[PDB]
Amino acid sequence: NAGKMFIGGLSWQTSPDSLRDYFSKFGEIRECMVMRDPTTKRSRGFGFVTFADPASVDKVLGQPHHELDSKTIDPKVAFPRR
Amino acid sequence: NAGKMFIGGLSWQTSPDSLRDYFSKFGEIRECMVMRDPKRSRGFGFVTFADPASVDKVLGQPHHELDSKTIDPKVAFPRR
């Protein structure tokens, strides 16, 4: 549904509060989660954000660069299928 | 939480129902979900097993394949 985004490339050290704190700069956030890639303890992880205002997604995508915990992260519109 | 796994590299071919059918052979599944990237090659799948034991059966099988693609199921530790 609306307002949801899937984010790739998170540092292995990025916490959910680091993910929430960065993305709060484009709007209020309903739900936020980080999932580690366990192939290594030093592997890039994945993030999920659910914005309160679905216009927040637009604000995110209008940036050319996104950086978090010194890694370039890759926010995408989420396309879930249960 | 427990009993969760994720799979990368899913083709557009693979339906959520196909993913569920694949992993149900290792045990009953509570949740199953696919996240596509539309850009023409590989999305992500998420499965929640009823019983954590089912994760051990997936990981004790060394080679996995789904809809022509080798897949590499991994334990998922989501943290909100």
Author numbering:
A (entry chain A): 19 to 100
B (entry chain B): 19 to 56, 59 to 100
Question: What are the paper's exact sentences on this?
Answer:
Musashi‐2 (MSI2) belongs to Musashi family of RNA binding proteins (RBP). Like Musashi‐1 (MSI1), it is overexpressed in a variety of cancers and is a promising therapeutic target. Both MSI proteins contain two N‐terminal RNA recognition motifs and play roles in posttranscriptional regulation of target mRNAs. Human MSI2 is a 328 amino acid protein that contains two RNA recognition motifs (RRMs) spanning G21‐K111 (RRM1) and K110‐P187 (RRM2). The C‐terminal region of MSI2 has no known motifs or specific function, while the N‐terminal RRMs mediate the binding to mRNAs,25 including those involved in the proliferation of certain cancers.
The crystal structure of MSI2‐RRM1 was modeled from residues G21 to R100 and consists of an antiparallel β‐strand core that is flanked by two α‐helices. The two subunits in the asymmetric unit form a noncrystallographic dimer in which the longest β‐stands (1, 2, 3, and 6) are positioned towards the center of the dimer. The only hydrogen bond interactions between dimer subunits occurs between residues F97/R99 in the C‐terminal β7 strand of subunit A and residues V52, M53, and R54 in β2 of subunit B. The structures of subunits A and B are quite similar with a root‐mean‐square‐deviation (RMSD) of 0.81 Å (80 residues aligned) between Cα‐atoms. A small difference between the subunits was in the loop that bridges β2 and β3. It should be noted, however, that the crystals are tightly packed as indicated by the Matthew's coefficient (Vm = 1.7 Å3/Da, 25% solvent). As such, it is possible that crystal packing could affect the conformation of the β2/β3 loop in each subunit differently. Notably, R60 in subunit A forms a contact with Q81 of a symmetry‐related molecule. However, no crystal contacts are observed with residues in the β2/β3 loop of subunit B and residues T57 and T58 were disordered. A high degree of structural similarity was observed between the crystal and solution NMR structures.
